[PDB]
Design a protein around this ligand. Structure first.
Ligand SMILES: Nc1ncnc2c1ncn2[C@@H]1O[C@H](COP(=O)(O)OP(=O)(O)O)[C@@H](O)[C@H]1O
Ligand SMILES: [Mg+2]
Length: 576
């Protein structure tokens, strides 16, 4: 690869500038953003400033985080500034790496969109990265579902923004429906730096974002027409040859249907016309005005055939149905032909127009809108062809910082699921006994629960991450490399949270309240022994309970082991 060779020369140069950066004060270092922007206003192009800008970020990260960008992270940063994907293995530091191109592009003053995969990660990377960006004179926004338009607009106004693919695309659709540009929230789609880019740009590429709403706004007919039914009096039978009534409508409890007598049609017609929904002399069976017939026949049914606390209930301002078994109440179900609306309208609660698609976009089309697009992932090379053909993104495999020595053992076949699950359990117990921790990836909650319950029978304490409380599960995952830890996770659970061998001592320190030097030195000295032992015991061991249809997904699982040169192993189990 010739591209890596050109970029190595810049890495060395950036390295050559470190001594001069170390002399700058925190204020001289902070002024760098303004010195760069003046250059840009006086003839510089962004690419000229790449060395200098990266060296400023690195040295800033030294002082703020205690983290000096590795050479390979400098390489990935340069990739990310071109229209490319940087494949950087799990735990190669993609979050810190992204600060290089995000700093560089934010100088342009047009904003930067960092995309992660879920809301917990967007806020985490923003807040983790925020001290480095504020140290350098930049602001950092966080776009989250449920934020009001002013707050979102402030987050898009910041130098750099974080958010999920869903909420960025939802903002754009909502922006396309604005009546003038003033209501919008986004600026121009300038730079989209997409974390976990195979999840986002490939797996969700074709899945569309949809905003549903009503255009058939026919509530005033429902509400107003409802006013007429209280005026109608009920009678026991239809006005037959043998029977006569003094009322406006009847009812078939047996056949569950409503019949209207001629005087009611008079009065309804009178009242329909009267309030201002009809005309004099109009036939209400008239093909001309037959919307009302459905309005009235639904309204009439709503009062006549359906009764509250019997067929439905009115909790939380939603008309809810009740199953004939009287057992339960559905929460998504509605009623056809305007029946629910009339029923809702009779109770007065929340008239529900029909909802339809009002705006739609695929992430494919969406992320193609940005002027600059880039992406990082631990697993991209296999998808290189659609990255190029769909987005014109080129992929670049980035050397790991240290040598990758994880041992991906051969798969194992068994005749039946029972046997596979007994063999995994036997292997868990074995590796626990030695102190080695084990992460068990599944591809479904169903398979997580089955495995969990076999681990329980076997007396094996373990944790189950189902990807429903990302922040909580993130806290469990960070300890999953504790000696003899046992964690179950579906492919979607706890991704993006480093699993440190021996546990994360960071977590331990926060647990204590105002610790002291030798208390913390206690944690640190204890953790090192844990880490040396776990590393000695083979590190983290991955068990795949089955292989995904897409091998890349299995590759993401095993990648959770073997970070930054650590020992580790993985193994997938198969059966019929
Ligand atoms: N240059 C660095 N020096 C020290 N630690 C780093 C550096 N870069 C990243 N880290 C640490 O590595 C851990 C994993 O980084 P992360 O961004 O989660 O990896 P990835 O997203 O690439 O899988 C984090 O705890 C982070 O603080
Ligand atoms: Mg990550």
């Amino acid at each position: 690869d010739r591209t890596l060779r050109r970029m190595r020369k810049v890495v060395n140069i950036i390295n050559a500038m470190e001594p001069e950066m170390e002399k700058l004060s925190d204020e001289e270092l902070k002024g760098k953003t303004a010195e760069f922007r003046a250059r840009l206003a006086a003839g510089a192009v962004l690419e000229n400033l790449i060395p200098e800008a990266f060296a400023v970020v690195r040295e800033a990260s030294k002082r703020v985080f205690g983290m000096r960008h590795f050479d390979v992270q400098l390489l990935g940063g340069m990739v990310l500034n071109e229209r490319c994907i940087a494949e950087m293995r799990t735990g190669e530091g993609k979050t810190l790496t992204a600060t290089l191109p995000a700093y560089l592009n934010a100088l342009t003053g047009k904003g930067v969109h960092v995309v992660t995969v879920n809301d917990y990660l967007a806020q985490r990377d923003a807040e983790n990265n925020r001290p480095l960006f504020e140290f350098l004179g930049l602001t950092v926004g966080i776009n989250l579902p449920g934020m009001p338009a002013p707050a979102k607009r402030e987050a898009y106004a910041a130098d750099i923004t974080y958010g999920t693919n869903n909420e960025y695309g939802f903002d754009y659709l909502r922006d396309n429906m604005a009546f003038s540009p003033a209501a919008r929230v986004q600026r121009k789609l300038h730079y989209a730096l997409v974390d976990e880019v195979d999840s986002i740009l490939i797996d969700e590429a074709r899945t569309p974002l949809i905003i549903s709403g009503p255009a058939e706004d026919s509530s005033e007919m429902y509400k107003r027409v409802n006013k007429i039914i209280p005026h109608l009096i009920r009678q026991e039978k239809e006005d037959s040859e043998t029977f006569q009534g003094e009322g406006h409508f009847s009812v078939d409890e047996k056949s569950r249907q409503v019949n209207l007598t001629e005087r009611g049609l008079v009065l309804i017609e009178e009242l329909l016309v009267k309030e201002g929904i009809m005309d004099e002399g109009e036939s209400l069976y008239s093909p001309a005005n037959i919307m009302l017939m459905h309005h009235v026949t639904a309204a009439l049914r709503a009062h006549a055939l359906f009764t509250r606390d019997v067929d439905y209930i009115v909790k939380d301002g939603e008309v809810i149905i009740v199953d004939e078994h009287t057992g339960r109440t559905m929460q998504g179900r509605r009623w056809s032909d305007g029946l629910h609306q009339a029923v809702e309208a009779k109770e007065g609660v929340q008239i529900q127009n029909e909802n339809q698609t009002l705006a739609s976009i695929t992430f494919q089309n969406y992320f193609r809108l940005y002027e600059k697009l880039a992406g990082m992932t631990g697993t991209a090379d296999t998808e290189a062809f659609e990255f190029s053909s769909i987005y014109k993104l080129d992929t670049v495999v980035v050397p790991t910082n240290r040598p990758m020595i994880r041992k991906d053992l051969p798969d194992l076949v068994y005749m039946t699921e029972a046997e596979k699950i007994q063999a995994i359990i036997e292997d868990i117990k074995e590796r626990t006994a030695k102190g080695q921790p084990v992460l068990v990836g599944t591809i479904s909650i169903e398979k997580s629960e089955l495995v969990s319950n076999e681990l329980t029978k076997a007396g094996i304490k373990h944790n189950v991450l189902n990807a429903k409380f990302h922040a909580n599960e993130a806290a469990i995952v960070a300890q999953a490399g504790y000696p003899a830890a046992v964690t179950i996770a579906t492919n979607m659970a706890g991704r993006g949270t480093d699993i440190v061998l021996g546990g994360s001592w960071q977590a331990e320190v926060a647990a204590l309240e105002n610790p002291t030097a030798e208390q913390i030195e206690k944690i640190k000295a204890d953790w090192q022994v844990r880490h040396d032992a776990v590393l000695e015991a083979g590190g983290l061991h991955i068990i795949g309970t089955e292989r995904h249809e897409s091998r890349r997904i299995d590759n993401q699982l095993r990648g959770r082991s073997g970070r930054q040169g650590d020992a580790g192993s993985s193994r997938f189990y198969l059966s019929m």
